[PDB]
Design an enzyme around this catalytic site. Structure first.
Site, short mmCIF file in Angstrom:
data_model
loop_
_atom_site.label_atom_id
_atom_site.label_comp_id
_atom_site.label_asym_id
_atom_site.label_seq_id
_atom_site.Cartn_x
_atom_site.Cartn_y
_atom_site.Cartn_z
N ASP B 60 0.83 -1.20 0.00
CA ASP B 60 0.00 0.00 0.00
C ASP B 60 0.86 1.25 0.00
OD1 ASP B 60 -3.09 0.65 0.52
OD2 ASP B 60 -1.91 2.12 1.63
N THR B 93 -3.94 5.62 -3.29
CA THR B 93 -2.99 6.44 -2.56
C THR B 93 -1.67 6.60 -3.29
OG1 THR B 93 -1.93 4.70 -1.26
CG2 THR B 93 -4.08 5.48 -0.53
N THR B 94 -1.26 5.61 -4.09
CA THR B 94 -0.04 5.76 -4.87
C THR B 94 -0.30 6.39 -6.23
OG1 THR B 94 1.82 4.59 -5.87
CG2 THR B 94 -0.24 3.40 -5.66
N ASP B 391 -9.01 -1.88 2.13
CA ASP B 391 -9.16 -1.32 0.79
C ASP B 391 -10.40 -1.87 0.10
OD1 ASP B 391 -6.99 0.38 0.87
OD2 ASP B 391 -5.60 -1.07 -0.02
#
Ligand SMILES: Nc1ncnc2c1ncn2[C@@H]1O[C@H](COP(=O)(O)OP(=O)(O)O)[C@@H](O)[C@H]1O
Ligand SMILES: Nc1ncnc2c1ncn2[C@@H]1O[C@H](COP(=O)(O)OP(=O)(O)O)[C@@H](O)[C@H]1O
Ligand SMILES: Nc1ncnc2c1ncn2[C@@H]1O[C@H](COP(=O)(O)OP(=O)(O)O)[C@@H](O)[C@H]1O
Ligand SMILES: [Mg+2]
Ligand SMILES: [Mg+2]
Ligand SMILES: [Mg+2]
Ligand SMILES: [Mg+2]
Lengths: 525, 526, 211, 538, 106, 49
Positions: B60, B93-94, B391
């Protein structure tokens, strides 16, 4: 390094460096734990910072007692800790299989192959291996003989021969004693005590309880033949009022009256106990034993001893359930409704004194559902080693009883499973056949290490065993005395099926997760 | 002597001009490069070391960024936006970090060409508005009643995680947990998985044995061994007040002058406990749950009525039990009512897992809270599994609240980039160049997917762009595992519209915020 | 710890498998760095000395000397490569790669309980057989200009840029053919190598005289 | 080419201060060397001719003695293997009470011969198996070596002769006197019931008059003075109270609430009258001696002096319990007068001065009672401590004799016979175990060898003569320490005998320690810590 | 001697054995006896000992003088102990005891 | 679990003060950045102005 441009005080390993570091750590751990596997393994001496001495060959205990500060070692140690917590056995095999999986995977990764293919092969091989293990398990009725064989297979690896035999007898007898048909086995009902006065082979099983405390009043009887057991959780000592009472008097006579009248509350409960004792046994033939989880002040002790009552105080909390199941009475938190049916029965109660500490024995129970193993030895490290060994044996016997299937040991199942994986390898599409081959070679570590510890050569013994298995089809393992192929089932070398399943699952998962790591970072400062 | 005189205090540094802008953009680019390789189904995990000795093995992006420490404030801003994206929608998030880094990278080119940052910001805002428009235009509706499509969405959300091996089980677990947690009262829809969807990890066993319970599971045991450890249809009564004798709030003091007053007071303590337990018993319950201590005398009086008691449960666990079994937590048992008795729990079992006792209130009929029991190899593996399940549940909640979908695998990126480029042809001012720059900077997602897959970036991306130049080809993306262009109508990788909208908004706004900045000043106290 | 550490307290000793592991790790590291040198498709390396002198190289021996290594096994391998360069002038990178791979393959069997003596015996037998096969496979041929050009190309292409290599091929072959006596040993001391710093790298040539 | 890096794997993973030792040469030989060093340090104190050692611990406390267990206790042993052997010796001390030096010497000899066997080519497992087989053979042989039995324990002369040998090793010059003292003290104890309690023998050390002035007293001696004015009672009727000699007080909280002047004037007078009534009630039962475990109130002391009651205060409750056992009284929890069953009787209680210290003596005239006391005189505290250790050894020997009454010849006779028989047995056993069995038999020579070395004669001549005589057929012939040349004599007539249980347990524990030391193959020592002692030991 | 990687006793332990140790013990006893030699007889002399606090003590009594000396030699402390014993049991002869013991050893 | 050891091989054999950079990101991009910095330093002196 990108990370070091932000935090200059960081340690980073990237790309091939991360794999090299992880595989080197795993190989080091495997190198240290190779010598534990099998009954022919070597003992280790573990000296703490304070100077305490331990003599163990357990994988989990050894891993805890190494002076290691490596991250991959920490991960493998946590995996082994979970292994020990759930199944209670197979930690050294866990570490060895993880290390060999990583080594075999690196053998292909170093030639340009991406680790993802190796992980896919690992998954396929794990599925096939689980299917084969399902096919190979031996469903049986867990009589006494099979449990004794399993207990030997564990304890011979944990301790030496005759001590292992004694521990097998004790462990099997205790488990069969506390076991209820079609009911999960509660291992909390086997109390493990340690006394440090006799030889290690004096460890035995007592069909009752052994309490590390005795009667604190000298006038109390040291041996009661026929005892009525009263397990209570009622405080028999002076208790302050919760609302800050204090006393107010105007003369010495009033002070004496208040002193005499402040004990009436506890004296009422003591009188209730004495009345029950008098009603139950009107003569000196029978005895009365009061085991209390809370304290008893000296006045109550004297009042009880005047009536020939043995009173124990500050007993362990688990001892309430243990005595309820063994003696057969009921644990009471109050004496308001005190009845003769609330008393357990014990056929013998006596106190044993050893040095400055006294022990109480409660034996000759009718049908004790909770027993105790009394560990005896001349040294503290001997006691700790025997405690670890009996923990392993109890876990092994409980696992064997839980599912009616048991797996042949001595490396036979790994050899057959590797052969099945090799046969199944062509069916796997793509280059995952390399991962399947790596998984099979990693599985073959157990017979290799067994041959090493027995003093033979890996290649000759392994090819002999594999050829025998291919030619005959039987589940042939390793003979630690001669090195020849040998059928594990016929001699009585059994391994827990749940232990092997957990080994496969955990080893595959941890190897797959480690192989996919491409960066190690320490930048939290 | 004669210390020098200064205007600003000592160690008060000041940097200004092009250097500040270049430093901020390079800091953002470095932060993006940290997690560039953790994107897509072929992502490789990272192994982080905590200052306290813990180890975080994760894929993550938000976890990786929050587990590291930086001193450059632009890096702090990037960490903050990663946390914001994680908290708002649950994933992406990335992707947001990579997009923001690329946007700042392409803004530096104009900042070096005598273009004021305000013009770049205006162009970025216009571009963001057009991206929102295009994303809403290319979305497709979804019916939440079709469980198969929900499972497929969750799968496409979790194929990039370490749980893709057991993706089917993970999707079923997440869907069931979200469906049970969903609740409505007073006309207020509520999906609160933070409090009422608890993930409990017990190391050991196999991950295939992990499941979501129709109830709760707490690490508690009976107060007394005599109490039943197995009840078929328990009538649960919840409490948050201690069942002991406690001092009052006021400054109370007794004064004893008679012989029988002391024993009388002790007897009143016992009688108060007895009356309290009798008030509890009057409702005829089967189990009693308290958040505070239960006295031994209270335990005796409860066992006299064949009642199981669990002593000290946490507030959140008690709330979960109340939601699951339909009880209502009370404090004064003299005010206990029939409506507060929790009926609905289909079984109460207290069995030993490993060497610990666990209480199960499973088998509830229509529970509004659940416990996800995770079993696995170790604590790190289970922590990663918990993050992946979080997630999945966040994506399921986002789809349930907002039922639109957009194509994945870079198809949305290429479609929006093409639409932005086509609209840019109408503009004639100087703002068109940064507009197109951010449009093509949006193409970093398919490029990163191709790079992680191991294929050739230049020709595959050129072919994808050429395909997207056609009319009905906005759903054409890249395979993350084979490195080929496919139609996402066939691959089935779709993403919630809300996640993409939030990602684009956060990326563009972070670019704007870091573009507005100049004249860094540091060193002063608080 | 050991006997040596008992006699000399400040002594560093590696015994039994430790020494073998240390040597194999050093050889593997050297091989890992020098893998990229092999072949014309290899990568240039920038070597910066303490004084700041910049040196671009692809030669294995040159890379080894300007390596910042303090390992004993690395020193042994570097000396072997130095002798190889001194006598034949080629094959240093191949030398290091073959040594490292031999050690790795030997360890692959040694780690499974096999004694290194058997591996060395197999190495000797294989070396004898390989020398026989190399005698069998060599191509004897009278060396005209074309074959020498081909050999010079096969070396210089792996050393430098392709066009620079093409120029250097003609230069070196012409020089060697010029200074070569009939059926006599070639004295390379008669080819002065003089360097000037005013033109492009492709302007290097051969002067039929002396500078 | 100037430094040897740490090998990849475990060596690099090891902590900073940690140490790792693996393999024969690096672990087993080092452990054997450490154990041999410990055995050699303790060796010189073995036997009657052993030499005392001045050992000063970390607290500057001087110990001078030849008791092996005490020396090992006061030595800061650091090696783990030596720690294991010390644990075995202490276990022998706890189980039996004598034979610790034998355990240490036998373990050292066994480990030295084990190193020799490993050097010649035997494996650790083979040596361990041979040692276990030889230990079993020795335990089988030992009952056949019993020469005589105790056959009486209520006698005085015979038990003194039995206990002389145990306290001849320590205090070789004067053992008959100590044997007589300990025999009298133990015979007073040990009633018709077969149970004998070691704790019932008390030792009070009073300085000044040389150990030859020591005596045994049937009662208890307390080194303190009386609280009251009465210092001698001839027909003591001691009443023992576990409560302070004061007016009992409320456990909750005391507060005298005064509301009128009459109460204020009458409170102290009423309290005094109440305490006087209590003391008079106690005295009316005939109790002329009162013993309390708590403080004594001033009014209590005044009213006890008024009624002529001797007051003795015992701060330690162990002493209170021992006094209750001695006199035959019961510790009253309150200050109520004692009933006739709870009032102990002692034939004489008085305050006396022995040397310098004041003592209170609870003296019985009969040669019986639950507790007997030996008062030890001397010119030095250390000498008295050594005499006390000898007394403890004698009492433990008496207890062992009460448990098992069989005896074996001493002075190395039993060891030599055991060595001969085990060697004969091993001469027939085929296989590699014969070497280990023969070495186990030879390890018994360390006892007569140490005795001869301490005596100052040639050990080899003594051992050769012992083998010659034992081959002739004399199993009760051992070393003769009363000679300047190597000589042997029959030791059944000499009365030098050892307890069977002592030898049995010593052999068992020594063999167990040796095999346990041999079993260790790797050592992983953590970095030493300077913690303020482990919490278990406080 | 040898380094012995793991040493037997704690580092810093001092051991002395054999004839030299006993001869040194005798010499220490002689040194202790020399401190009270001149206090014996009608022609005896007094000794003045000052402690760390600066308080001086003047005594002809052998036991007092030996007590004031902070003797730390283990063999020498025996003379002080026997002087204390003689003072406790008898009260006189506290110098003769030490002189006789040291003369025996000499 | 608090320190990352050096990877076995070249990383461990490297000298104390020596620095090793390999790959695109570590070497090529850094060199390009340094050359860009030099060009930016000298840029403002170009031309008659
Ligand atoms: N008597 C025996 N003969 C042959 N093989 C055995 C025998 N006893 C145990 N084994 C094998 O040796 C292994 C012992 O491993 P062990 O030391 O118990 O590791 P762990 O404690 O981690 O399970 C088992 O896998 C078993 O199959
Ligand atoms: N099967 C697939 N083929 C191609 N691309 C995929 C596939 N599954 C997911 N992706 C892409 O990978 C991205 C998700 O990667 P992930 O690591 O979850 O990043 P984030 O945390 O930002 O969501 C999505 O943008 C999606 O388009
Ligand atoms: N008079 C004696 N002559 C010869 N040997 C004796 C005599 N008295 C005792 N011994 C021997 O001395 C040994 C006792 O040694 P000792 O110092 O007591 O060691 P431990 O206390 O460990 O037994 C006994 O084995 C005994 O045989
Ligand atoms: Mg095991
Ligand atoms: Mg995602
Ligand atoms: Mg070349
Ligand atoms: Mg003795």
């Amino acid at each position: 390094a990108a990370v070091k441009t932000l935090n200059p005080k960081a340690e980073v390993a990237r790309a091939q460096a991360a794999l090299a570091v992880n595989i080197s750590a795993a190989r080091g751990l495997q190198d240290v734990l190779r010598t534990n596997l099998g009954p022919k393994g070597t003992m280790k001496m573990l000296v703490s910072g304070a100077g305490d001495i331990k003599l163990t060959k357990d994988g989990n205990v050894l891993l805890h007692e190494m002076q290691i500060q490596h991250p991959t070692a920490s991960l493998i140690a946590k995996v082994a800790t979970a292994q020990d917590d759930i199944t209670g056995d197979g930690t050294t095999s866990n570490v060895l299989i993880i290390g060999e999986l990583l080594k075999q995977a690196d053998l292909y990764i170093s030639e340009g192959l991406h680790p993802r293919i190796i992980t896919e092969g690992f998954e396929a091989a794990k599925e096939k291996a689980l299917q084969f293990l399902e096919e190979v398990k031996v469903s049986r009725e867990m009589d006494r003989e099979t449990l004794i064989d399993v207990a030997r297979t564990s304890l011979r690896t944990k301790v030496h021969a005759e001590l292992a035999d004694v521990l097998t007898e004790a462990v099997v007898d205790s488990i069969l004693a506390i076991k209820k048909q079609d009911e999960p086995i509660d291992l909390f009902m086997i109390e493990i005590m340690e006394m440090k006065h006799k030889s290690e082979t004096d460890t035995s099983l007592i069909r009752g309880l052994v309490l590390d405390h005795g009667a604190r009043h000298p006038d109390m009887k040291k041996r009661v033949e026929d005892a009525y057991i009263l397990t209570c959780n009622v405080s028999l000592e002076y208790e302050k009022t919760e609302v800050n009472s204090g006393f107010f008097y105007k003369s010495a006579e009033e002070r004496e009256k208040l002193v005499k009248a402040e004990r009436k509350f506890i004296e009422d409960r003591v009188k209730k106990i004495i009345e029950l004792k008098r009603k139950v046994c009107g003569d000196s033939d029978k005895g009365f034993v009061v085991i209390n989880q809370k304290g008893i002040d000296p006045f109550s002790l004297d009042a009880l001893s005047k009536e020939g009552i043995v009173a124990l105080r500050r007993a362990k909390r688990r001892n309430m359930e243990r005595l309820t199941l063994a003696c057969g009475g009921v644990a009471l938190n109050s004496f308001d409704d005190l009845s003769p049916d609330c008393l357990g029965h014990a056929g013998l109660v006596y106190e044993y004194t050893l040095g400055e500490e006294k022990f109480t024995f409660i034996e000759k129970c009718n049908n004790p559902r909770s027993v105790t193993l009394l560990i005896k030895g001349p040294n503290k490290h001997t006691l700790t080693q025997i405690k670890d060994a009996v923990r392993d044996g109890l876990r092994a016997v409980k696992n064997a009883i839980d599912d009616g299937c048991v797996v042949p040991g001595a490396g036979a199942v790994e050899v057959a499973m590797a052969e099945a994986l090799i046969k199944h390898k062509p069916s796997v599409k793509g280059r995952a056949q390399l991962g399947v081959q790596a998984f099979a070679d990693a599985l073959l570590i157990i017979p290799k290490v067994l041959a090493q510890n027995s003093g033979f050569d890996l290649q000759e013994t392994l090819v002999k065993i594999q050829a025998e298995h291919s030619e005959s089809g039987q589940l042939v393992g390793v003979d630690l005395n001669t090195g020849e192929p040998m059928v594990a089932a016929e001699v009585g070398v059994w391994d827990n099926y749940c232990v092997k399943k957990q080994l496969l699952h955990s080893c595959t998962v941890i190897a797959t997760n480690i192989l996919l790591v491409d960066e190690i970072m320490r930048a939290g400062m | 002597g004669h210390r020098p005189v200064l205007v600003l205090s000592q160690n008060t540094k000041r940097e200004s001009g092009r250097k500040v802008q270049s430093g901020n953009i390079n800091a953002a680019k470095t932060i993006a490069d940290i997690i560039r390789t953790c994107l897509g189904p072929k992502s490789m995990m990272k192994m982080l070391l905590d200052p306290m000795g813990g180890i975080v093995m994760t894929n993550d992006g938000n976890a990786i960024l929050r587990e590291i420490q930086v001193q450059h404030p632009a890096a702090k801003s990037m960490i903050e936006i990663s946390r914001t994206q994680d908290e708002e929608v649950g994933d992406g998030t990335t992707s947001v970090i990579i997009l923001a880094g690329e946007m700042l990278s392409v803004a530096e080119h104009f900042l070096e060409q005598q273009m004021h940052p305000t013009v770049v910001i205006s162009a970025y805002r216009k571009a963001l508005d057009d991206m929102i428009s295009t994303l809403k235009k290319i979305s497709i509706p979804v019916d939440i009643s079709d469980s198969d499509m929900m499972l497929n969405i969750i799968n496409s959300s979790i194929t990039t995680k370490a749980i893709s091996r057991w993706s089917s089980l993970a999707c079923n677990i997440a869907l069931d947990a979200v469906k049970m947690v969903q609740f409505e009262e007073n006309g207020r829809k509520e999906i609160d998985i933070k409090k009422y969807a608890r993930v409990e990890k017990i190391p050991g066993g196999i991950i295939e044995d992990s499941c979501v319970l129709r109830g709760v599971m707490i690490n508690k045991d009976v107060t007394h061994p005599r109490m039943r450890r197995y009840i078929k249809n328990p009538r649960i009564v919840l409490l948050d007040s201690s069942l002991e004798y406690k001092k009052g709030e006021s400054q109370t003091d007794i004064e004893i002058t008679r012989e029988e007053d002391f024993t009388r007071i002790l007897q009143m303590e016992e009688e108060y406990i007895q009356q309290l337990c009798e008030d509890i018993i009057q409702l005829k319950p089967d189990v009693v749950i308290t958040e505070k201590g239960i006295s031994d005398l209270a335990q005796h009086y409860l066992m006299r009525a064949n009642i199981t008691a669990i002593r000290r449960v946490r507030k959140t666990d008690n709330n979960r039990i109340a939601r699951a079994c339909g009880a209502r937590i009370v404090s004064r048992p003299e005010e206990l009512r029939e409506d507060d008795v929790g009926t609905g729990a289909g079984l109460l079992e207290i069995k030993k897992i490993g060497d610990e006792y666990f209480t199960f209130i499973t088998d509830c009929k229509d529970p509004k809270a659940c416990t996800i029991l995770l079993r696995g190899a170790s604590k790190e593996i289970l922590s990663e599994v918990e993050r992946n399940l979080q997630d999945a549940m966040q994506v399921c909640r986002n789809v349930l609240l907002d039922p639109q979908l957009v194509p994945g695998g870079g198809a949305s990126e290429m479609a929006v980039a093409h639409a932005l480029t086509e609209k840019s042809k109408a503009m004639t001012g100087v703002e068109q160049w940064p507009y197109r720059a951010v449009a093509q900077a949006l193409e970093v997602i398919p490029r990163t997917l191709i790079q992680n897959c191991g294929a050739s970036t230049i020709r595959l991306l050129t072919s994808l762009r050429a395909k997207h130049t056609q009319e009905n080809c906005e759903t054409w993306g890249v395979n993350g595992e084979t490195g080929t262009l496919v139609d996402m109508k066939e691959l089935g990788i779709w993403e919630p519209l809300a996640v993409k909208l939030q990602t684009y908004k956060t990326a563009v706004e972070t670019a704007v915020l870091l573009l507005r900045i100049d004249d860094i000043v540091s060193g002063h106290k608080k | 710890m050991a006997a040596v550490k008992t006699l000399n307290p400040k002594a560093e000793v590696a015994r039994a498998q430790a020494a073998l592991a240390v040597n194999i790790s050093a050889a593997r590291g050297l091989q890992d760095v020098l893998r990229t040198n092999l072949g014309p498709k290899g990568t240039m390396k920038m070597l910066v000395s303490g004084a700041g002198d910049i040196k671009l190289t692809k030669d294995g021996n040159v890379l080894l000397h300007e390596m910042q290594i303090q390992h004993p096994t690395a020193s042994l391998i570097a000396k072997v490569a130095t002798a190889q360069d001194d006598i034949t002038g080629d094959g240093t990178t191949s030398n290091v790669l073959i040594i490292g791979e031999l050690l790795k393959q030997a360890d692959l069997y040694i780690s499974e309980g096999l004694h290194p003596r058997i591996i060395t015996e197999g190495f000797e037998a294989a070396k004898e057989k390989a020398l026989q096969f190399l005698e069998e496979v060599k191509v004897s041929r009278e060396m005209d200009r074309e074959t020498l050009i081909d050999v010079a190309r096969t070396s210089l292409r792996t050393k430098v840029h392709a066009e620079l290599a093409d120029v250097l091929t003609e230069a070196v072959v012409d020089s060697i053919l010029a200074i070569k006596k009939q059926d006599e040993p070639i004295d390379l001391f008669m080819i002065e190598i003089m360097e000037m710093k005013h033109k492009s790298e492709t302007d290097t040539s051969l002067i039929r005289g002396l500078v | 080419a100037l430094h040897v890096p740490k090998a990849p794997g475990f060596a690099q993973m090891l902590k900073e201060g940690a140490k790792h030792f693996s393999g024969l040469e690096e672990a087993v030989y080092r452990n054997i060397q450490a154990c041999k060093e410990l055995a050699q340090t303790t060796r010189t104190a073995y036997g009657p001719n052993g030499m005392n050692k001045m050992v000063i611990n970390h607290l500057e406390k001087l110990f001078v003695t030849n008791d092996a267990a005490t020396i090992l206790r006061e030595l800061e042993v650091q090696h783990p293997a030596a720690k294991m052997i010390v644990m075995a010796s202490h276990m022998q001390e706890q189980e039996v009470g004598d034979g610790t030096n034998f355990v240490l010497v036998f373990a050292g000899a066994l480990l030295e011969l084990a190193e020799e066997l490993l050097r010649i080519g035997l494996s650790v497992s083979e040596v361990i198996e041979g040692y276990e087989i030889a230990c079993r053979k020795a335990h089988e042989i030992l009952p056949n070596l019993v020469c005589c039995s105790a056959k009486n324990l209520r006698d005085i002369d015979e038990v003194s002769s039995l206990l002389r040998t145990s306290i001849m090793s320590k205090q070789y010059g004067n053992e008959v006197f100590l044997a007589k003292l300990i025999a009298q003290a133990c015979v007073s104890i040990f009633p018709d019931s077969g149970h004998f309690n070691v704790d019932n023998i008390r030792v009070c050390k009073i300085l000044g008059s040389g150990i030859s002035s020591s005596s045994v007293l049937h009662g208890m001696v307390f080194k303190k003075e009386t609280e009251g004015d009465v210092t001698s009672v001839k027909d003591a009727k001691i009443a023992v109270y576990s409560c302070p000699f004061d007016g009992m007080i409320t456990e909750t909280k005391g507060t005298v609430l005064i509301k009128t002047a009459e109460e204020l004037m009458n409170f102290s007078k009423g309290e005094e009258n109440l305490m006087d009534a209590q003391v008079k009630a106690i005295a009316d039962t005939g109790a002329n001696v009162v013993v309390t475990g708590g403080k004594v109130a001033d009014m209590a002391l005044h009213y006890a002096n008024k009624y002529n009651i001797m007051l003795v205060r015992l701060n330690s409750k162990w002493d209170l319990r021992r006094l209750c056992k001695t006199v035959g009284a019961t510790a009253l929890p309150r200050l109520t007068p004692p009933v006739l069953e709870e009032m102990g009787h002692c034939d004489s209680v008085y305050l006396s001065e022995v040397g310098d210290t004041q003592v209170v003596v609870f003296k019985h005239e009969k040669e019986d009672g639950a507790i007997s006391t030996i008062v030890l005189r001397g010119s030095t505290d250390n000498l008295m401590d050594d005499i006390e250790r000898a007394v403890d050894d004698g009492v433990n020997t008496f207890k062992v004799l009460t448990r098992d009454k069989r005896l074996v010849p001493g002075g190395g006779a039993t060891e030599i016979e055991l060595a001969k028989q085990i060697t004969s047995y091993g001469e027939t056993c085929p296989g590699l175990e014969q070497y280990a069995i023969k070495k186990f038999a030879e390890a018994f020579e360390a006892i007569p060898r140490a005795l001869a070395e301490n005596s100052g004669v040639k050990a080899n001549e003594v051992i050769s003569k012992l083998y010659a005589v034992h081959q002739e057929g004399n199993k009760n012939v051992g070393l003769d320490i009363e000679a300047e040349v190597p000589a042997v004599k029959d030791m059944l007539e000499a009365g030098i005998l050892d307890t069977y249980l002592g030898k049995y347990w010593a052999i068992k524990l020594a063999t167990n320690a040796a095999v346990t030391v041999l079993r260790v193959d790797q050592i992983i020592m953590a970095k030493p810590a300077g913690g303020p002692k482990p919490p278990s030991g406080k | 001697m040898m380094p012995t990687p793991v040493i037997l006793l704690k580092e810093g332990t001092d051991s002395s054995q054999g004839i030299p140790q006993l001869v040194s013990n005798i010499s220490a006893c002689q040194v202790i006896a020399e401190a009270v030699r001149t206090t014996l007889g009608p022609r005896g002399m007094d000794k003045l000992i000052v402690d760390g606090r600066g308080k001086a003590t003047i005594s002809n009594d052998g036991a007092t003088i030996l007590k004031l000396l902070d003797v730390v030699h283990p063999a020498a402390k025996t003379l002080v102990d026997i002087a204390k014993s003689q003072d406790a049991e008898v009260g006189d002869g506290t110098t003769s005891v030490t002189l006789l013991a040291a003369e025996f050893l000499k």
